[PDB]
């Protein structure tokens, strides 16, 4: 944890990048699963509480009130504006499709897989 501010947030298909008031550079493979490899500056980051606090801030930012929008944004690599769901397939405002990830029930994390051809 910390009382510093996240001065900068960016999103990729591969990770969420963050820059803090203290000057640190987070590189976080969101959502957080056992598969995630996070980086603080350019050394590995193993503080799961720190990663989950930044992930709560990111869920608030990218998904607005709906976290699901944040998880779809992580899966898609871009900050989406809205989404709709039908029969388990989630379509964002840009037309991108997603399904629940195979690991969602086992990790007990809300993760999504980009399903282009579903």
UniProtKB/TrEMBL annotation:
It comes from the Bacteria. This is Uncharacterized protein. The lineage of its organism: Bacteria, Pseudomonadati, Pseudomonadota, Gammaproteobacteria, Moraxellales.
